[PDB]
Amino acid sequence: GDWSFLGRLLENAQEHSTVIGKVWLTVLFIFRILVLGAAAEEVWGDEQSDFTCNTQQPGCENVCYDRAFPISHVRFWVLQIIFVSTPTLIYLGHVLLLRTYVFNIIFKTLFEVGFIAGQYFLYGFQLKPLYRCDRWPCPNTVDCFISRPTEKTIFILFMLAVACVSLLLNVLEIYHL
Amino acid sequence: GDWSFLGRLLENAQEHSTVIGKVWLTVLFIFRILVLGAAAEEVWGDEQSDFTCNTQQPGCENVCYDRAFPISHVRFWVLQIIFVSTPTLIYLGHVLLLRTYVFNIIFKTLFEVGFIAGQYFLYGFQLKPLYRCDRWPCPNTVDCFISRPTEKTIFILFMLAVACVSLLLNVLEIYHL
Amino acid sequence: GDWSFLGRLLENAQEHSTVIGKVWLTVLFIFRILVLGAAAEEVWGDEQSDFTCNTQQPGCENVCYDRAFPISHVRFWVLQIIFVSTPTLIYLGHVLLLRTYVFNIIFKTLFEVGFIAGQYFLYGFQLKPLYRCDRWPCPNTVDCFISRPTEKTIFILFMLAVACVSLLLNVLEIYHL
Amino acid sequence: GDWSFLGRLLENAQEHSTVIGKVWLTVLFIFRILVLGAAAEEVWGDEQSDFTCNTQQPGCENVCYDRAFPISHVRFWVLQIIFVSTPTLIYLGHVLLLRTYVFNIIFKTLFEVGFIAGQYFLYGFQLKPLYRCDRWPCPNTVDCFISRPTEKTIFILFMLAVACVSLLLNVLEIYHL
Amino acid sequence: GDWSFLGRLLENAQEHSTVIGKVWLTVLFIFRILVLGAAAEEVWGDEQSDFTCNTQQPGCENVCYDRAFPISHVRFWVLQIIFVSTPTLIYLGHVLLLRTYVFNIIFKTLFEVGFIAGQYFLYGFQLKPLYRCDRWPCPNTVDCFISRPTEKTIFILFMLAVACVSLLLNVLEIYHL
Amino acid sequence: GDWSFLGRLLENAQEHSTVIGKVWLTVLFIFRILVLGAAAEEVWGDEQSDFTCNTQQPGCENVCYDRAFPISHVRFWVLQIIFVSTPTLIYLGHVLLLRTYVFNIIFKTLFEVGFIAGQYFLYGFQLKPLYRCDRWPCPNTVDCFISRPTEKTIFILFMLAVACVSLLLNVLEIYHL
Amino acid sequence: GDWSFLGRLLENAQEHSTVIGKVWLTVLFIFRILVLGAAAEEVWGDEQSDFTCNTQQPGCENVCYDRAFPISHVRFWVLQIIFVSTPTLIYLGHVLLLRTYVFNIIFKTLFEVGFIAGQYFLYGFQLKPLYRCDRWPCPNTVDCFISRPTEKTIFILFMLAVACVSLLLNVLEIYHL
Amino acid sequence: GDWSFLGRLLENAQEHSTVIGKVWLTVLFIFRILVLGAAAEEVWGDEQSDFTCNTQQPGCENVCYDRAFPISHVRFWVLQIIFVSTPTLIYLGHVLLLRTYVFNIIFKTLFEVGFIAGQYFLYGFQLKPLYRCDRWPCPNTVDCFISRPTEKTIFILFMLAVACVSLLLNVLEIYHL
Amino acid sequence: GDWSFLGRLLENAQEHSTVIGKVWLTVLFIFRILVLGAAAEEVWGDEQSDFTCNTQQPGCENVCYDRAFPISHVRFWVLQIIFVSTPTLIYLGHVLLLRTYVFNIIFKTLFEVGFIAGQYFLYGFQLKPLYRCDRWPCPNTVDCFISRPTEKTIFILFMLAVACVSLLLNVLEIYHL
Amino acid sequence: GDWSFLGRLLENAQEHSTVIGKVWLTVLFIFRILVLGAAAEEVWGDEQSDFTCNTQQPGCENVCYDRAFPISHVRFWVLQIIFVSTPTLIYLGHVLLLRTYVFNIIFKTLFEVGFIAGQYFLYGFQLKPLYRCDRWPCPNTVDCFISRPTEKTIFILFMLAVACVSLLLNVLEIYHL
Amino acid sequence: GDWSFLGRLLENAQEHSTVIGKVWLTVLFIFRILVLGAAAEEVWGDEQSDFTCNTQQPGCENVCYDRAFPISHVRFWVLQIIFVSTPTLIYLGHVLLLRTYVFNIIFKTLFEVGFIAGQYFLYGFQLKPLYRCDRWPCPNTVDCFISRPTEKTIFILFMLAVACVSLLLNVLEIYHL
What we know:
The structure is cut from a larger assembly and holds eleven copies of chain A. Chain A is mostly helical.
């Protein structure tokens, strides 16, 4: 995607961050951003198309999709990356400051905890193929099947593990300080 | 998209802008432009395709879409970004000037207020799935369903909050001066 | 894809790696990454679309695909590349250390052995066109045909040979030390 | 495609290669790579889609395609380029050596002869529109028609002529030495 | 497309070319390459898809397309650009030589005359919508309609005029020498 | 249809009925029954089939038909014939009786008045092609078109005129007595 | 059809009719009724089905048929037969009377003249295949094609000639009296 | 239908039955049999065809029909007529006997009570358009719509009233004896 | 069909016709009428339906059928039977007369010769499956295939032989007189 | 159907048969033949049409039907009636003879036992909706659903009970002799 | 069908035929004609419709049917009945003559032998479901499947056995004379 500017600004920030923060940033680019842009977009690219329901109702497919995936995992991870990476750029701007750094890392930690919690609240780290929806255009509990459930589940687990690792890194960093 | 030149010119302008203006610019790139190019274009990419109406009239779908979304949110946000970012480049050109800066920020504020007002006037920060249209090819109040209503609503709210934050930043800046 | 940052960091690492490690890195870019991005994505791009089953059940296609390819070979190779390339960046970060280098190469070796083993466990280096699935929406052992089986098999063999060559390179390097 | 890194490394190698080798490299980029990336990918992009067979058997199309084109010409040319260009990078790495250069050029010559021979063995420099296939899902010698046969034939001839020219260049170079 | 390397090499060559040759090169990039990459690829992108014939024969569409457009105008113009631009790079390589320059310009002139002549021989600077084909799968002179005939005709005329202008430039240059 | 037995019994009754009653009976067979069996059944035979609504709702057609024609004109006329002809057979059975005959004719008159009144109440002697229905499966006032409206209207008028003539005959008969 | 009773009553009437009237009655049964029941019903049986219009409007076919054939020729001929044959049964009833017979034949003559005149007024003894209709559901002068136009025209001519012959017979009879 | 033989045998029986029994028999032919053969068979002729369910399951329509109408009303009424009319022919055979006649009428009464009771048990004298079925091929309570519900309801009521009248006739007859 | 009345009248005529005329009449009923009503109507019943042309033009099928079969063989044979059988009824009416009989048989002979000649003129005693039509809606010589060509040819030959036999019978009869 | 001649011959035979044989014959006409012609033909009329299988194989439906119902119940019952009724006509012909009558009744008994046994052997007095077939065109045990299974089962039971009653009648008759 | 007249004439002939000839005639009506009219026409009624081939060629179905069944078994049996029954009517006409009777029976025998021989020559008393046809519109040996093969085979065997029995009857009769 249009990730170049963020990468440039964070390369600028890397010269100011600590060792473990640098490790976190390389985890972000190599794992969070790269897997999201290179693999996932090809996976979730057929999310609306190949979501085939079991009715002749014309509108049931759109609505039952929106009831299944109110916000796709790709968009959610994108916003997670942005909201978790902004504090780094705040700190860099402050440089261009210990308590500032501390507030930066707690912002990261709290937002990322919020994101994993929200992801669990929406989709409990598993996409089942079947979804039974009862929205109005859909009559009487339509069965609707999802595309690439196993693959999507795998990438959810992988990215959730990456986020847990980022939390571990920040929780190690805060004690290292 | 073809955002590179604007980014270069605004990197040139960043060396001349204040602290809070720099914060505003990073808000613009990290939030306004990035989320618009990376996430939204994948969301609104299936706006015309998966807009399935409930008739056999051939032309009802095209017309009812145009009656629902006269101008998609993506194009509207693009024009919002451009019209809000041009004053920065005007000011930079003037540099290459206090009252100039002041007129710059009021231009930003007024245009952005206009854009949030227009967005509310068209789509009241919520895309409902159902739209009932009565254009001529559509006979007798056709029901037409929209793709990704919840996700689109979420991104509308997110970008509207970003714009409100930009207004807060400019209104803080004008008093800071 | 969005491979530029990894390439930059590994160009930085190339100045610190040995001769045989440099050979391994050029094998990675010229063969692993390039063939994956230039050829394979065009091959596996029609994996879900042209996977035509032999039933009128609406959901049988999605489910039988997911039962055939839980995770596509492209995503698997991407993760293989990432997990095999991260130790190089760890070592570079340590530079910016002999035992560190040794642990780096055994990490590469063990992960890559794990990946070839997993690939064999899932798909035994051959995609047959026919897959007979018995998932619930599919009634009574549906026949489902795959797109580009021979080509996909060829690229599996090619990439598996590349990975075996990387293992040979690392096993030559460890004795060269 | 993701050709930038190869181009950079070969620009590095150009300062070390002879005149005729430099001519060969410019032939590679201007003709082999550029025509493959700019024109051919648009040609062979509709290879699986518009390959319309003459049956109602659902699986006959996939299988008969795979029996016609086990590996598409685009992928084959990509691998040809890689396997023919790797010796240049080997030689550059050795520089960073006359017999090395000689072994480099014979590697190029032998691999490229192998590739033109394999291409002739698979597709005898002509794509006919009709292919009659008798694979199992296809009953009784189905007729299947190919998309862009004449154009594909033309590009096969053009690239085969380019490869013959590369062989002529190397065979002139080896005597020039 | 993947035009960057050619552009770089020709920027290198621009410092050595004359005034009128520089004008020719800017004509090439601004008109030949840019219009071909930015506009035409969007025009001819729906060449095979929306070519709707008037039969139920499954194979008639593929064959009648190939009989209409053996080689699309986009590919033809690409090869025209390459074959016309190679002499410039030959001359640059010779620099890194008056008779060399003269042979360069006559190569350009002769190849470009050949290309306009071939284009006239295939498609007489006008795409008519209707094409009546009598290939074997098509029974008894099928009518087949083409997509964007007027637009394609316009771009043919524009590019043919650009090529005529390049011939005028070279014929002015040769007398200027 | 299976009209033979009624015809036989009424041939038996004809020997006992008066002149004007015999005229009425021949009006019944020649006009009421014959036109109903020979022409109308061919007209209303395509009543449910070619009743094409303007929606993709699957159930809207069945329901909107039933809301348009709760009971088809053919069945209604059949029951009219039966209910109007039974008194003749009652009278014949009484023979095998002046006041009996009088009660017979008033039964005919009253039932036939009831039938023309009911026909007017349901379908006001005119089938318009368009019917706008709002039953539950039909969303928002579907337009539904009817087959053979003009012809059906003509036959309604013809049979209604026949019934009016039967009323005139009975009202002449009662005074003739 | 259900013609048996009319035939029986007219067999009763044949013993009372003259020679030329008997000829007329045999013309009626052998030509009018038999050809109508044996051939025509098979011809006009596909009148609504195979009337294929040239639009995607769902309702245009029903309406344009009704605008073409307000009342099919078969129903019209049936009513012609009935209205022309009733006077014979009136006369028979009067028997069970010269001026009565005369009024009978003028009734026949006048009604039959009315029927041929009406048939000419509706369909000028020729069914053309094409009908261009502009009813409301049909947009902008739809072309609609008719089934069996030539055959239907032939049977129209044949039955019209039969009716003209009946008029000649009655006009000969009235002078024979 | 093939009702002629029953009618002949019952005409033979009519000479032996009483007045009220003769009335019952004429009620049977004029109302039970005639309406069943002339009107109902045209009504229920589109029972399986135009029973359109709201799913893409192929088998749901057949099964849900069978679950709605295990035995159609037409077949049920046919068997009712047969089982109610057989005692008359038994009695006639006995003639060719007062207690025999009495047992005959109680057989009629009891069987007809059984038939109206069974009809109520299956279909409570009303066909609703909607039927919600949950048979195995039908997933999750499919909605299925019925053809001619109102008309079928009307004919059910009419025939049920006829049967009640037959019961009244027999209950009057038994006291008349 | 509705052949009963003709059969009755000709049974009346059989008592007056000679031996060979009686043979002719039994040939007519057993062969001409019976095979036409029992077999042929089942053959030609799918004449318009299964006449599948090779175009997407909607109207080409109707028109090309009418151009192939202006009048179907069944209708033609029906009219042949009528026009050939009327003289028998004329003669019977004259009875209820040698020169009358002679004129009767020459009428039969001449009309039947006319009918076989017309049949040859239209369809030369052979229905080929393929018909190539060029009517206006059909573009450029559409191929259209016929249903049951061989069977229809056989029945044409059989009925033509029957007619030739009738001519032989009449030509034997005229000399027998 | 064409049952009239059999009925006439058996009416002739009724004057010669005993009381219980006459009862059997009336059971045959009222129950066996009438229910078969009036109800069953309407039931089994949609046997091949609405037999919807669950595959896209074109030929699987025809073959799986033939594997389910090698001979439909209607044809089987027709042949049962014929083979059981022929002995009556044999006996009548012998009349126009006690041991002859005895052989007649044992023929009836044995053939009817054979028919009920064969019916049980084919379809065990119950049509289940689902049939799983594995014929060659059908791949891997297709599910195929039947139309009107419950109704068909009911009529099987009814006719089987009628046949058992005929056996009881004959077994009572043989002892009565 | 329209069998009544033949039946009447053969009832007239029955009074003149011998015992065994009468048996033959009752075999004809009860078995040949009745089974042909009551059962077979329902079987072969779906011969052209449900003959589903395995191609997208539009014309292949019509042609391959005609190549499979040049003349359906029903028409063939009808003609067999007629050609075998005509001698009986010839003999009756001669009555209204021993050598005449003898020539009659040899005509029957020879024609019926010819018919069974022709039936064997066309369809060897077995309809297989699969037919592989290579007519021109059908490309490359299409597979085409037949409807009701087993049932049709059974009725072929039954009618062939009936014909063999007729031959046995005539061969017994000729010796009985």
